[PDB]
Design a protein around this ligand. Structure first.
Ligand code: ROR
Ligand code: CA
Ligand code: MN
Length: 237
């Protein structure tokens, strides 16, 4: 299967597959069953901001999610990503709905990776930033129901013209260029990702969430990965 590392913004508690009994943030290493979670006080209809950081020295993947005027939620997990991921990856956003639903709207997305070697003055680096998505976004790969360009946003999951989210939807967006997270002469490797998002539901119980992920470069939406599997995983193992 694909190899997946993800930070999940999980809006629906599937306690049968180990979710806590509340909306939560989590760190997913090759399984939808988060290695670590923290409670997340999601705010229906408000614009949130997620931040993800990691470096190869501390080997700690951390995330922070916040809304204006509110405390933030944070979660961290010790993992060496060079032991999980291949040396070339793609980075992306994914989201899903099931029998419960929500908008999975991305308003902005930025990423920076750096490989610093022991050569004097020798950094390799990639940075992108989207504050405005367009209809024909050639530096993104859209998969499943993902679309760009309406209100300059990336709608990861399906929404009607009148703007109501649809259930049983799944969509991802990957940056077009492969990213290099390891090289043999690297003395420090780091990445960071930020995204702003607007999850809205007509319903008291929204589902299913949004994830930032890192994958093998050929990664595709697994079969049956609507709902609780967040467009990331083929099953709940
Ligand atoms: O070797 C590293 C460089 O290619 C970097 O720019 C990549 O991580 C980004 O495409
Ligand atoms: Ca869930
Ligand atoms: Mn979860």
């Amino acid at each position: 299967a694909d190899t997946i590392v993800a930070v999940e913004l999980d809006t629906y508690p599937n306690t049968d597959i180990g979710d806590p009994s509340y909306p939560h943030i989590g760190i997913d290493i090759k399984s939808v069953r988060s290695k670590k979670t923290a409670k997340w006080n999601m705010q229906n209809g408000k614009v949130g901001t997620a931040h993800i950081i990691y470096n190869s020295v501390d080997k700690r993947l951390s995330a922070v999610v916040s809304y204006p005027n509110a405390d933030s939620a944070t979660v961290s997990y010790d993992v060496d990503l060079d032991n999980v991921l291949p040396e070339w990856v793609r980075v992306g956003l994914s989201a899903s709905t099931g029998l419960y639903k929500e908008t999975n709207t991305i308003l902005s997305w930025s990423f920076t990776s750096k490989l610093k070697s022991n050569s004097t003055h020798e950094t390799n680096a990639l940075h992108f930033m989207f504050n405005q998505f367009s209809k024909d976004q050639k530096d993104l790969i859209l998969q499943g129901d993902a679309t760009t360009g309406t209100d300059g946003n990336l709608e990861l999951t399906r929404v009607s013209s009148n703007g109501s989210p649809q259930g049983s939807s799944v969509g991802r967006a990957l940056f077009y260029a492969p990213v290099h997270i390891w090289e043999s002469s690297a003395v420090v490797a780091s990445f960071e990702a930020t995204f702003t998002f607007l999850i809205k539901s007509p319903d008291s119980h929204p589902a299913d969430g949004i994830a930032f992920f890192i994958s093998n470069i050929d990664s595709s939406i697994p079969s049956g990965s609507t709902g609780r599997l967040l467009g990331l995983f083929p099953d709940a193992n």
